[PDB]
Amino acid sequence: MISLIAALAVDRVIGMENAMPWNLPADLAWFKRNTLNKPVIMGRHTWESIGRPLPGRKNIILSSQPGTDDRVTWVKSVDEAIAACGDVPEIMVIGGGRVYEQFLPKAQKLYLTHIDAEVEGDTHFPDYEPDDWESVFSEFHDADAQNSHSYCFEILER
Template identity: 45%
Template sequence: MPNYSIIAALDRNRLIGTDNKLPWRIPEDLAYFRAKTINHTVIMGRKTWISLGKALDLRTNIVLTRDHSLVYPGIIVVHDITELENYLEEEENFIIGGASIFNQFLPLANRLYLTRIEAEFTGDTYFPDCEEEDWELNFFEQKTSSNGYIISFNEYKRIT
């Protein structure tokens, strides 16, 4: 079975997006995301793909969508998890959003990589609730970003 990891940045209220975009721009979080996902497969929903506007370099990009008419150059498009798994190996595969994809994969994920931003933003898309007793914190690093936000990198491993 493929190894799924979820990677996301969220504010104090679990906000992850506004109008299909990140509500913030934090260079340290973007660098963390790149370092973790480089040379791995990234899996996203259609709206996340559209918000990116292009394939992420040095990664296999897969879009999971119900729309069978979508074709994207340089991107693998799949329509369900069974089809998705035909393209995956047992290495770490990163779920990068959006909210409905996070909801779908949270029960399947073995790891969570969450950047927590100690601020409140306005938006319309939230990270799903997850049972804290199912996860063990393996790594924590807190810092002040170059644009003044207190952020922490939190890496969790599933324990149940």
């Protein structure tokens, strides 16, 4: 079972200058509670953006050139990245945009964070067909001190 997990502000924007333009601690905490204790696959750009291994998670990184970090696994094809993860209930594609474009067909589950926000961005979440996806869960939170914008977690299922 392969899952994508992301945070999309309006017009499906996911990043700007190899960052996420928002800082929502409750999103980074959602992301953790779900990804924790399971393989995470990511692109090199995103590995740099994060720029540290995520504890708990076996970190697996997609790049066509040799690895520059010994404490994470490095891989060159989609299948190599899957095999890396092992025999597990659930895999977690944690980004970025070019990775999501490739891992959606094999995906059976989405974890979106819908963000009530208008940001400029260079990177977009793919265009998922709201037919082939069934919303199995939703949860809206208001803007608070730390969480500058309102947001809503959604899980979908193929």
